[PDB]
Amino acid sequence: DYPKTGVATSIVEKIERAEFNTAGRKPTVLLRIADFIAAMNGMDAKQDMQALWDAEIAIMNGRAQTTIISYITKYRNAIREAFGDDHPMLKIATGDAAMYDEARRVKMEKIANKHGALITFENYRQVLKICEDCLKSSDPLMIGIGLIGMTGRAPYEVFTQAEFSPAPYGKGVSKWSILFNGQAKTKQGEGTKFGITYEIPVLTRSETVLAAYKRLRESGQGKLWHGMSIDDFSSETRLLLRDTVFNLFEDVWPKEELPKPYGLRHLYAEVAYHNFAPPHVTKNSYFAAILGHNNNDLETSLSYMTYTLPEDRDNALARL
DNA sequence: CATAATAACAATATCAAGATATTGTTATTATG
Incomplete structure (x- = not known):
């Protein structure tokens, strides 16, 4: 909980680039990660972290296990980028x-x-x-x-x-x-x-x-x-x-x-x-x-x- | 109406025994 604020610039830039595209899917997952990191800003209690991660996990429910694992890797990397390797969410997420x-x-x-x-x-x-x-x-x-x-x-x-x-x-x-x-x-x-x-x-x-x-x-x-x-x-x-x-x-x-x-x-x-x-x-x-x-x-x-x-x-x- | 673009979705193969980083497949979106 040493840093309470952070921004995963990778995801954000990947969204700003995709704001104006001719065709293709909508970056829903990147959006969920962005909103995740956004909601994480200012948190000092771990119960709410746990709730946030419980909801986020509850989202990708009817999917493949490999997909879920990969997405978890995405979330974790986003957290490492935004806050650091010391954040308690890494033990939760x-x-x-x-x-x-x-x-x-x-x-x-x-x-x-x-x-x-x-x-x-x-x-x-x-x-x-x-x-x-x-x-x-x-x-x-x-x-x-x-x-x-x-x-x-x-x-x-x-x-x-x-x-x-x-x-x-x-x-x-x-x-x-x-x-x-x-x-x-x-x-x-x-x-x-x-x-x-x-x-x-x-x-x-x-x-x-x-x-x-x-x-x-x-x-x-x-x-x-x-x-x-x-x-x-x-x-x-x-x-x-x-x-x-x-x-x-x-x-x-x-x-x-x-x-x-x-x-x-x-x-x-x-x-x-x-x-x-x-x-x-x-x-x-x-x-x-x-x-x-x-x-x-x-x-x-x-x-x-x-x-x-x-x-x-x-x-x-x-x-x- | 195909059509191409795009990222979701998914699996494999590495460093390390708990996940990360690559390679591989398909549904959606705007558009022409």
Whole structure:
């Protein structure tokens, strides 16, 4: 209760921008958050805080649990922005503890189901070739896609904040590996890849990737993308990227699902493990190494194992 | 009447075991 007044400038600016729009939805949630932070101003009693949060929770009732959790993240971030990390509301404005447990349960359950039913990525070579061809395109979006397919970085990392640099092999450059900076979703942890330049494998010669990236950065849309926030990047590119991926790998992607930009990261993991993995490491370890995870974290890699390579599928049936 | 824009709505994958930050889908709105 040290600060009793505050303003979440993010939401407010997002509303002022949306005051004059040609079309689209009405920012109802942003409005509820704004009115929330507004009502929070001047409060010193915690019972009324609890009542406010009880009503606000009572609002988003007939919705999805994931949606509710995400919205709670929104509210909490708004509170942190407006007042600070010392406000009692942060201990009040949180989700029911039995909700997060159900979430975790469902998550690990899904992963477990995916691990018992791997998808055979039969035409993966064609996809890799498609990305490699996108590496030589003049459309920055395409170059971005191909970069996702080849270096395996996330769309946010690739389009907004990647720094690929030549990796030395003793003396000269490495043909099948580059350097990378910086990782996303790290939240600035002690043992995360925050501000860490580490070596990653690539699925085509390093000169080609470096060239395509150098072209990507110096473009107009590339400059428009650099340093962008996640919401900005979303509203700017998300649907276009989605439909371009939709149209690209239309008839070469596994029939069990639809082409999504993040599948290229999974395929990157599987293939680079299939080609470059040393004999004294496990799959989880190599995955954690090349994907850049928290220190001593091998469970996050479990979410990246959903595909199975045709050759493995073949020689596994060789035991007949 | 489609039509495109827009944010609600939703799920996944990370750092840390209690949530945050990314990626992914659809209903609404103004408008032409």
